[PDB]
């Protein structure tokens, strides 16, 4: 099972982008998303989608991201421009058979995430969207396989 | 060459999602993006990226999307969840040797997008971000090689 941990969500600014992260996570085969800042309106939006389009994807908000990432029972993946290329490590991640937590949304020089993660993974050295980074990570993990709701 | 056509840009509502679309278009190997509503902030942002990171990508805004799509000289692709499975059609599109214009919308897209397109293309039947739809479209078009492209 893959869980996305989305940090740096600002309820009063980032509803759209965080929504886009959650829908991408769901569509491309993650089972859950955890969001740092509590956002009941986001929960209601996403839970609405899940109701309307099916399946058991989970959203929780108001999470302590360092604790969730630190104590996750499985592989901790940090999506970041400061990371090695996904292709270098994706097979080993996939072949591990473990649950995976993928951290999206880190900023600054992301020390606390780098202190915790098992893998720090980039797609390109060009500026990209975290939404597109998450899509590519999930696509590579699931090897381009399609999903059934 | 791939040109992205981004519609339903509403610059006084949000510029982040369209900026993310443009950054994705550029990084994933499109040559150009055309955006329906004029947005000089967007133009300058993306031109700033080109200045610092290289390559020859172009952005224009304030475009009549129906006219651009209808009269584009090449294959008109519309990315939509209500389209055909991408893997059914991506090979024909790639092997045509034609230029491609890829329409990416937001909220509801006008029915004309579906009627004009040569191919209405679904990366998934589930609601997703236009950013991730575009990423996967380009990724499949370029068969995973686009991150080797030089800027």
From Swiss-Prot, chain A:
Compartments where located: Cytoplasm
Gene Ontology MF annotations: tRNA (cytidine(56)-2'-O)-methyltransferase activity
Binding, S-adenosyl-L-methionine: 79, 105-109
Keywords of this entry: Cytoplasm, Methyltransferase, S-adenosyl-L-methionine, Transferase, tRNA processing
Its job: Specifically catalyzes the AdoMet-dependent 2'-O-ribose methylation of cytidine at position 56 in tRNAs.
Record bears the keyword Methyltransferase: yes
Organism: Thermoplasma acidophilum (strain ATCC 25905 / DSM 1728 / JCM 9062 / NBRC 15155 / AMRC-C165)
Native organism taxonomy: Archaea, Methanobacteriati, Thermoplasmatota, Thermoplasmata, Thermoplasmatales
The protein, known as: tRNA (cytidine(56)-2'-O)-methyltransferase
Self-association and partners: Homodimer.
């Amino acid at each position: 099972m893959i869980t996305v941990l989305r940090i740096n969500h600002r309820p009063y600014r980032d509803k759209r982008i965080t929504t886009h992260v959650a829908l991408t996570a769901r569509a491309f085969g993650a089972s859950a998303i955890l969001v740092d800042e509590r956002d009941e309106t986001l929960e209601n939006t996403i839970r609405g989608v899940i109701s309307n389009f099916g399946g058991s994807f989970s959203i929780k908000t108001g999470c302590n991201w360092i604790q969730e990432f630190k104590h996750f029972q499985g592989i901790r993946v940090h999506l970041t421009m400061y990371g090695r290329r996904i292709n270098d490590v994706i097979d080993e991640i996939r072949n591990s058979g473990k649950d995976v937590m993928v951290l999206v949304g880190s900023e600054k020089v992301p020390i606390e995430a780098y202190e915790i993660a098992d893998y720090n993974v980039s797609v390109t050295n060009q500026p990209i969207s975290e939404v597109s980074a998450l899509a590519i990570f999930l696509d590579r993990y699931f090897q381009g396989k399609e999903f059934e709701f």
